[PDB]
Amino acid sequence: LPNSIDSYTDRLYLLWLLLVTLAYNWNCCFIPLRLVFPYQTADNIHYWLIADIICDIIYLYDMLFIQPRLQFVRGGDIIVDSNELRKHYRTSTKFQLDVASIIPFDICYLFFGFNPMFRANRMLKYTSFFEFNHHLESIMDKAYIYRVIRTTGYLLFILHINACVYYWASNYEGIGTTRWVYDGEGNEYLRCYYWAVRTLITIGGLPEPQTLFEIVFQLLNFFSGVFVFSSLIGQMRDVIGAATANQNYFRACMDDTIAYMNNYSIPKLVQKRVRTWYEYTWDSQRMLDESDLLKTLPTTVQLALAIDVNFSIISKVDLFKGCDTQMIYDMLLRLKSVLYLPGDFVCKKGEIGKEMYIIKHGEVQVLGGTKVLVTLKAGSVFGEISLLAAGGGNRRTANVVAHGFANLLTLDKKTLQEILVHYPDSERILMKKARVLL
Amino acid sequence: AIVVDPSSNLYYRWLTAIALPVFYNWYLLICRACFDELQSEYLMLWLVLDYSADVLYVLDVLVRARTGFLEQGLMVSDTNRLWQHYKTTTQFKLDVLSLVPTDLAYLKVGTNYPEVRFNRLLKFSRLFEFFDRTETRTNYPNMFRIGNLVLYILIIIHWNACIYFAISKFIGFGTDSWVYPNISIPEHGRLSRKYIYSLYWSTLTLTTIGETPPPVKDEEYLFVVVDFLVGVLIFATIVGNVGSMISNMNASRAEFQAKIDSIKQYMQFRKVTKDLETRVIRWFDYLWANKKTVDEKEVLKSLPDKLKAEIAINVHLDTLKKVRIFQDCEAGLLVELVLKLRPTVFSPGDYICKKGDIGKEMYIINEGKLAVVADDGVTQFVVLSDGSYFGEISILNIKGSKSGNRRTANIRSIGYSDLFCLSKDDLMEALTEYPEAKKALEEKGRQILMKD
Amino acid sequence: IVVDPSSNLYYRWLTAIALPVFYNWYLLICRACFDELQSEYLMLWLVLDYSADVLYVLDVLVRARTGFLEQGLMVSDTNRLWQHYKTTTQFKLDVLSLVPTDYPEVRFNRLLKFSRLFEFFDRTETRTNYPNMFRIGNLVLYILIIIHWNACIYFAISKFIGFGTDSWVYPNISIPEHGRLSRKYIYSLYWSTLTLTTIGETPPPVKDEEYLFVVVDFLVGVLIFATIVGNVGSMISNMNASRAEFQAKIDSIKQYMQFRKVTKDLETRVIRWFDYLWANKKTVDEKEVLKSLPDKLKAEIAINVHLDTLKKVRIFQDCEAGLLVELVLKLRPTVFSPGDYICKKGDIGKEMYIINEGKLAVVADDGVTQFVVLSDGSYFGEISILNIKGSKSGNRRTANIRSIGYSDLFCLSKDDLMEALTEYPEAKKALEEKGRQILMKDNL
Amino acid sequence: IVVDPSSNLYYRWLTAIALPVFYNWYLLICRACFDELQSEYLMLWLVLDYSADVLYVLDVLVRARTGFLEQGLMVSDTNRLWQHYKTTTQFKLDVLSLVPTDTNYPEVRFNRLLKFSRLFEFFDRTETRTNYPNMFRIGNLVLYILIIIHWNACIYFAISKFIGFGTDSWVYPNISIPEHGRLSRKYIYSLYWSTLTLTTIGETPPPVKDEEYLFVVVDFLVGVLIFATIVGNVGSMISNMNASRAEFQAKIDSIKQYMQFRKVTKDLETRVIRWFDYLWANKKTVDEKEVLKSLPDKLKAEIAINVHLDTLKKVRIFQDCEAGLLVELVLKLRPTVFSPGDYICKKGDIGKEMYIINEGKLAVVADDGVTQFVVLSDGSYFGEISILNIKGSKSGNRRTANIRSIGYSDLFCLSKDDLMEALTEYPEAKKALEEKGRQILMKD
Ligand SMILES: Nc1nc2c(ncn2[C@@H]2O[C@@H]3COP(=O)(O)O[C@H]3[C@H]2O)c(=O)[nH]1
Ligand SMILES: Nc1nc2c(ncn2[C@@H]2O[C@@H]3COP(=O)(O)O[C@H]3[C@H]2O)c(=O)[nH]1
Ligand SMILES: Nc1nc2c(ncn2[C@@H]2O[C@@H]3COP(=O)(O)O[C@H]3[C@H]2O)c(=O)[nH]1
Ligand SMILES: Nc1nc2c(ncn2[C@@H]2O[C@@H]3COP(=O)(O)O[C@H]3[C@H]2O)c(=O)[nH]1
Ligand SMILES: *[C@@H]1O[C@H](CO)[C@@H](O)[C@H](O)[C@H]1NC(C)=O
Ligand SMILES: *[C@@H]1O[C@H](CO)[C@@H](O)[C@H](O)[C@H]1NC(C)=O
Ligand SMILES: *[C@@H]1O[C@H](CO)[C@@H](O)[C@H](O)[C@H]1NC(C)=O
């Protein structure tokens, strides 16, 4: 019992919402059961009262000692002060449902006996179940598993409610009176649940309804079964289309560029290299383009995400001490991440150079024209002698080939000058370090 | 000389008052035609209700002869041109066919055949127009989509029940095992039993459940196979509409979750530290829980520039008149300033601008609480609050001073601040056409620089 | 004579060859399996067989003299067309579909011209104006063909097993109730509908082959049902995709106006604007409509839309031809609400407007008096855009222009104008001297 | 030797190990539950079980020699591969699928089903390798349906054997009757019952006892979930199979509604619609940079020098300038598809684009009369003087000749500004192109 409950990094609070879910699920799944079936007998009534008192104690402990302790954000600032948390929960819209649910109609047991229709206000605390659903769907690493289990749970719950309504209608017409009603001969909940399954699921094969109340019942129940089965198909389609969305988008762009390379008659080796790039990009990043993702975020989280992945790689090179931090942040926001297949040429000796290469998760070699001089492992630098020079400047000194699936981080010279025009003093000191180092 | 307005609320109250007797005419005209105890038993009630439906049909002709229309932007308000634009429509032909006086033949046959009133179903366009106006007007569009779909398939299930009872009356009551049973038996001869068993048969056939007795004759085989193929099309539209309602009831939730899983996939690929990972994740859950996850430029993209400007004024101007600097300025500069603002939300602990950097942005605080700190850590010098302002001294680049364009202090956020980013270049191109306002902003910058 | 494959005569031939292909599918499996349709109406099936083979050899000639495109040009050399036809596989399918192997079981190669039926369905789907209604009709035709072929397969399996030896099979056809051909076809159609829609009022099977056929038929009916539901679900999701996108835009706007606490007058003004944009069908914007087109068709649509409106004003008629082409390429239209001020007094105007289907009026400062009422075709914004001597103001609005109704203007921005005004120098000296004449016309 | 997991030898092993995993699943539940299929064909099951255990042992020996990518290149060290195998949970599963639990009991070989990962890996590799992904997704769904139908048939026969044959009306009937006592009748009636239960049809006899009621409730509830997943996974396949056609129909109908709103004349309307029909018939509906924006510059340049360097090697201005500059040129080239008769540029329009003809036939038409001076075929080139803009020319600030298409030409365009950004890094070739343009302008 902390002074203030964080409710995002609190597994204990998730276990408490599991406890209010279990009390609320006891009420929803055992209100109509005791209300319709004769499972509230005289030698089980203390067991039903013991678990219903445990349910009311969990409801009351929720309304008193946990839900007035929740850390919430008002006006930007988070709140720790416990009287202010108590004022926020007391002036919330959860408290209307909670104090409307915990109203003791169990003191009305002296008027009309032990009747669980008095306790049918305990099902009004649905917001604890939906808070538990949202909190479990947010903590889970695979939300489609819990969406499938929740759609199964709603399906089994509507079949349980329909089994209780069929046993009410059987007791209302009389048990064993007509051919449609329940006969009486087996386990009452199992045969009534079987009828609710074969009606709700729109199967049929049951006895045909005989009187007019049974025809109205079977007609409304078959209509609700059509819409329950249609909602079940729609929920499974939503889970499927939101489960294979990234895979279907990757496959759609892959077959789109295969259709382009077959439409313009491109050979099998180049098509195999494009397909090898696509399979390695899916096996590494599990996404098509990371720049398309990072263009959606704010600039501050973009800055921190670029810093935590590249600032160690920039600072582990001995060259980059003297550069200033605003230019370093802008060049880390203006890095481009490309991939090189094994054997590809990143720097051909004699071509023009316009790129500073920051290597990350790869291993390229320099060939000065097949001997290995120094195998550049991850974190190293090359392409630094054509970035500092104006115009053509210097050509490449050696053929640089990528040995493995190298994932270079590239810094183009045009984007470097587009950074540099907003930083004159940085341009000056950068040119000075350029002249001293070369 | 009254002209109604088709975008108003009087026209929508008339669309409700004419989608009542159109729906009555569809439902109870097929039922009174096929069942023949409804027409003969409740004859005074149907005389009263058909008088009401015909009076509302005449008034719908008089209202459609006064619905204004748009040419050159303005509402047309002259009665001769309204009557001419009504008369050159097909809807006038459908309305004057829907008011053909077949009550002469209805009194000729002995007030027993409402088969002659089936041209009263010809105002289906008023019913479709009411459902269209409600589905754009209401606050629960998915609940109205399911109410509209349930009304459409209940029209079809009711019409097919009346068709099955008319087919059974044509073949003979209780000659086969498929037709409706013998109505001289007093259990099946009641009208509630007739209609509810015919509706039960029609629901079972048109939703492809089939617990019905199997047909005997070829006309019954043919009607049952036509009803089963119509029923598999009706079940296909039910599953398609409820699947579309489920896919559009959490479309924004699914796109936010796709963004969350893509960020989590990127951060497990590049392997960021867990404090930054939970910072970005709690930052995105805060943006979803405070309903601000979608960017203001993408929400307001569909709007015209005039309504974008009025929305930007009515949001940002009550913040931008709490700044103690911009109080002597004009309407065009305030309009362009609240146009060129872009809000970015910061998390706690996040740095806005660090000391010793080149200033390229100006910030105006709105629903936030900040703190200028030193280089050591969390030392609150000034707590910048709601409506206050910073960043206005290192974007103007006033040379000849001791500071220049260097942001003089480390600024961090205390809470979940929601600043208004106002860029340097977005200010200098918001002062390019206004040189007197430019030198007024330079003289107030000289005042606040003489303070700094 | 070369039949052009995108013409209207070729689609009339696609209709006239998709008729006997559909006949050959439907009635060839029915006449093969039922043996009383084939044996009773033998003159009618000989007449329709003669007409189907005549249309099949005429389709061989028409596919021999149809054209194709090399280098964008229509080929009309008949030996090249015949060689391009003979190299394809559809000539092999047409010469297989016209082997006179002549019991219509020997005529079952006539179903091999299925590509003309698929071509007719695709050409109608990209030519008609009710594509979802045609796709519903196409899906209903496909499932009626499968229901029919399953009825014929059930009657063939019943005839192979024995008529009325089991309870599963078709009953004993020597009884005159079950012996008629109408009863045979409609009971086999009723059985195949009950099986392939997975309903099951059918009698249960007895032998292992009947059990296995009903298993295979129920799995095929499950996949048929799944394909029907998937086609109608994608069609319902595409029939209102534009409506759902516009409602998502409306709901995001209303969520923004709830979150940023926008006042009720502006909330009902934006709600009135979205109601107007709904009721007058402008739910998609022209800036995203005109992105997918090529630049040549975009320029030609800009000519044919804007030039007849732009030459309605006589003082803007003195302009150069290709420069007017570029000007109507860069004219960007907007729509204004009633009561919306186009320009107040104390705002420096950076836009020129040409009124197209609207009605604007000039008013005083906070006073609705009508000096003049601008109309369709007239224009304004011309004295504060070319930097002329004003009345000690330069570029300032000297009049308040409201909107009387839902007016629509052609917004031509100042810097957007000038960045292409700089490239044509002498023509722009002519335009700036014309603007000096307009300023002389209004007020020195 | 180290087996590379991206090669084709590893996919041949994925087929040769997804064969006995599928045998072990299917026939191990059927041999366990049916008890005459195990007893009769015992020599066949001894041969197939020895073969499946030999393939499982070779699968362990292959997974101990399957390479894996560490820092971009494959590990070839066999001790490193063996330690990376031993630290996996798949080593525990691939050792647990080989324990000697042992003729009369095939339930002691139920640990052979634990190698499901090889079967799911083979289905994933076939769906990423085959040319028909929706056909393989239908085959995968039908195979999962048939495994579920078969396992439920075996479970119904085991439950009926446990309860008693023919004691109830729900269970499998009496085994000493020789009609029901044969193995083909046993398996096909249990498969018929499992199909009719799991597809939720329910024409089978209803349950009598309580465990039969509970098994049929659980069976209907498994079947409605499985049959909702199947209908959803077919409808999602159909919707994401025709999403591209639906997007093209949305573009076509939005541009149609825009033209019928803006009152575009019928000739331009028919020209736009015939251009869209041509684009849909020749499948150039996508945009080139929109479908290659995700590839890196090296592979974009590889495709671009593969398809454009053949037409760009024979040109007047870029003959032997620089190989990397031709790479940057074919990266910065950009397509536009033109209509027949469509003028590319008249007399009077200022030039800013160079065009390279590729699969088209153009014409230098005159002003008034349609006379073809010389037809420019594919590989030819124009726009050169108006993208070089040299001083000392006639310098009329107009293009000097009309260019009009004869057929559907596919011009690959090039802007002068994109030329200058290609030409910044090599200024000697800049001066070379200026002098070549001067030569061709003087020798026009
Ligand atoms: N030639 C060469 N370049 C090296 C070596 N080690 C690091 N580098 C860098 O690798 C480079 C590849 O590109 P550059 O020609 O631009 O310049 C070269 C050097 O900066 C080496 O041993 N030889
Ligand atoms: N230096 C400074 N800036 C302050 C103070 N209070 C508010 N601010 C704002 O904080 C700033 C941080 O960025 P700037 O340098 O851009 O400009 C500074 C001011 O606008 C203060 O006491 N000192
Ligand atoms: N100032 C002024 N503008 C007028 C008058 N009548 C029509 N107009 C137009 O109204 C205008 C409003 O915008 P502009 O300043 O752009 O230019 C002005 C003129 O084109 C008039 O009497 N005075
Ligand atoms: N004037 C002219 N242009 C030609 C000729 N042959 C090809 N072209 C190209 O056609 C052009 C049309 O546009 P440009 O003026 O831009 O430049 C011209 C040339 O590049 C020719 O004989 N004369
Ligand atoms: C219906 O019932 C009446 C009286 O019960 C009887 O005379 C008549 O024959 C019955 N009709 C049929 C078709 O059986
Ligand atoms: C079918 O009926 C005929 C006469 O009605 C009879 O001779 C024959 O045996 C019957 N066949 C079967 C299989 O019942
Ligand atoms: C099955 O048949 C045998 C002999 O025909 C009989 O003894 C046995 O009781 C039957 N089984 C049942 C369950 O009746």
Author numbering:
A (entry chain D): 206 to 573, 577 to 646
B (entry chain C): 158 to 609
C (entry chain B): 159 to 260, 270 to 611
D (entry chain A): 159 to 260, 268 to 609
Give the text the authors published on this PDB structure.
Cyclic nucleotide-gated (CNG) channels transduce chemical signals into electrical signals in sensory receptors and neurons. They are activated by cGMP or cAMP, which bind to the cyclic nucleotide-binding domain (CNBD) to open a gate located 50-60 Å away in the central cavity. Here, we report structures of the cGMP-activated human cone photoreceptor CNGA3/CNGB3 channel in closed, intermediate, pre-open and open states in detergent or lipid nanodisc, all with fully bound cGMP.
Third, A3/B3 was reconstituted in nanodiscs with simply 1-palmitoyl-2-oleoyl-sn-glycero-3-phosphoglycerol (POPG) and 1-palmitoyl-2-oleoyl-sn-glycero-3-phosphocholine (POPC). These states are named ND_cGMP_intermediate, ND_cGMP_ intermediate, and ND_cGMP_pre-open (with 33.1%, 22.7%, and 1.7% particles, respectively). In ND_cGMP_ intermediate, both helices move upward but the C-terminal ends move more than the N-terminal ends do. In the closed state and intermediate state 1, R410 of A3 and R456 of B3 are the only amino acids on the gating ring (i.e., helices A’B’) that interact with the TMD, mainly D289 and E292 on S4. In ND_cGMP_closed and ND_cGMP_intermediate, R442 projects to the ion conduction pathway with up and down orientations, as in GDN. In ND_cGMP_intermediate, the R442-V396 interaction is maintained but the R442-S404 interaction is lost.
